[PDB]
Paper text:
AtBFN2 (also called ENDO2) is a 34.5 kDa glycoprotein (the predicted mass for protein component alone is 30.5 kDa), encoded by the Arabidopsis thaliana At1g68290 gene. AtBFN2 follows the standard glycosylation pattern of plant S1/P1 endonucleases, with three glycosylation sites (Asn91, Asn110, and Asn184). While the P1 nuclease has a higher specificity for RNA over ssDNA, in a previous study we showed that the opposite is true for AtBFN2. Structurally, Zn2+-dependent endonucleases present a unique fold, and are classified into the P1/S1 nuclease family (pfam ID PF02265), itself part of the Phospholipase C (PLC)/P1 nuclease superfamily (pfam ID CL0368).
Residue numbers in the entry: 1 to 99, 107 to 201, 203 to 263
The structure:
């Protein structure tokens, strides 16, 4: 996701932390964050080049189908097993269980960002179009690629048009639905019979890529109201799942 997506996810997560996780997060965040996890939930994107090894950890590539399997798909272009967003979640969650040889501030920042990214449907999608990056279309009147539409445009368009430029408006509406509309689902979202369950989230993601993101889109299309309104609920779902799961995972880790 772009900035707004990670902010929403980390804001949702922050308020669902239990006291032990809230305390550990306070301790692990730098002072410049002023205690706000969401202030640093894009940090991982800002070290993709400084930490060149980290770039493939933001996503998963699959074959041209609607399935994901860790052993088959979790590797980078070099073929190194584990080097995908699911593997990264396993890695950084395991490190945080120690709360060495590792910088656990980075571990927290990585796991927070990656838990978000693994919920972006096109972050678990086809190698053949680089997760929709090579599908060039228009978002209303402006040129955009499909991946960017999912990272940013849908959310930014909702933020402006539907929420009158209040990002807290979308956070608040998601939080209300988590409590009053999706309560049974949320309990399932939180449940993990391991510390982290990223393969569940990736499998949902590739299915969404097939059924919602790629669905109906061709090179050169103009995506506007029809696509926007029909896909917004899935974006809401994934952001909500991301926040709920990030909190549940941190709670398990620090508890
Ligand atoms: C789990 O989380 C950890 C912590 O963030 C990640 O650890 C990093 O892993 C990468 C490799 O995947 C490391 O980067 C590589 O470092 C090599 C040498 O690093 C030495 O120093 C580190 C400590 O900083 C020690 O582990 C040890 O002393 C190492 O010997 C470099 O040689 C590599 O660069 C060269 O090869 C690459 C391609 O392979 C080229 O692109 C480069 O240009 C260069 O030629 C590379 O930089 C990194 O150092 C690790 N950091 C730490 C703190 O340990 C894991 O990757 C992560 N795994 C997941 C998520 O799956
Ligand atoms: C655990 O990991 C975290 C995250 O990587 C790390 O915190 C980071 O520390 C660095 C370096 O200490 C901070 O970057 C500095 O920011 C200050 C702002 O006050 C600048 O003054 C610094 O600039 C100088 O140093 C640079 C060094 O390369 C020079 O290039 C530059 O020209 C200046 O001389 C520097 O940018 C960074 O802000 C934090 N990041 C976060 C998110 O807090 C922490 O130190 C690690 N813990 C360890 C190693 O124990
Ligand atoms: C929070 O949950 C709210 C209740 O589910 C939801 O409001 C509802 O949003 C749906 C769209 O998902 C609207 O349903 C629309 O569905 C048909 C099918 O295309 C449309 O043709 C209709 O016009 C219909 O509006 C509901 O009307 C709407 N319900 C209410 C009471 O306003 C919110 O969108 C959810 N918000 C978040 C952030 O998740
Ligand atoms: N198919 C499959 N499922 C899950 N994990 C896998 C799989 N293949 C390899 N691994 C790795 C991923 C983690 O690094 C490690 C512990 O996962 P843990 O699940 O925490 O024991 O096992
Ligand atoms: C636990 C752990 C995993 N990893 C990597 C190896 C794998 O590619 C990926 C998932 O491995 P597991 O959690 O054993 O994370 C590390 O680099 N360091 C670690 O301490
Ligand atoms: C290459 C690639 C990038 N991405 C993501 C990472 C970034 O969010 C965005 C752009 O990355 P890029 O600038 O390296 O192409 O797309 C995927 O989801 N799948 C891919 O196969
Ligand atoms: Zn992202
Ligand atoms: Zn992206
Ligand atoms: Zn990212």
């Amino acid at each position: 996701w772009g900035k707004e997506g990670h902010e929403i996810i980390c804001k949702i997560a922050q308020t669902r932390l239990d006291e032990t996780a809230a305390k550990a997060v306070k301790e692990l965040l730098p002072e410049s964050a002023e205690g706000d996890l969401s202030s640093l939930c894009l940090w991982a994107d800002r070290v993709k080049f400084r930490y060149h090894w980290s770039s493939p950890l933001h996503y998963i590539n699959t074959p041209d189908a609607c399935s994901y399997q860790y052993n088959r798909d979790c590797k980078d272009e070099s073929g190194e097993k584990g080097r995908c967003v699911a593997g990264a979640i396993y890695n950084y969650t395991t490190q945080l269980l120690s709360y060495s040889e590792y910088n656990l501030t980075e571990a927290l920042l990585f796991v927070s960002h990656f838990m978000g990214d693994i919920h972006q449907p096109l972050h678990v999608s086809y190698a053949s179009d680089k997760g929709g990056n090579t599908i060039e279309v228009h978002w209303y009147t402006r040129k955009a690629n499909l991946h960017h539409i999912w990272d940013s445009n849908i959310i930014e368009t909702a933020e402006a048009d539907l929420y009158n430029s209040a990002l807290e408006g979308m956070v608040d509406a998601l939080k209300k639905n988590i409590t009053t509309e999706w309560a049974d689902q949320v309990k399932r979202w939180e449940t993990c019979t391991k510390t982290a369950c990223p393969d569940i989230y990736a499998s949902e993601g590739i299915q969404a890529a097939c059924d919602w993101a790629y669905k109906g889109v061709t090179e050169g299309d103009t995506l506007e109201d029809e696509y926007f309104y029909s896909r917004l609920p899935i974006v809401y779902q994934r952001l909500a799942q991301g926040g709920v799961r990030l909190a549940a995972t941190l709670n398990r880790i620090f508890g």
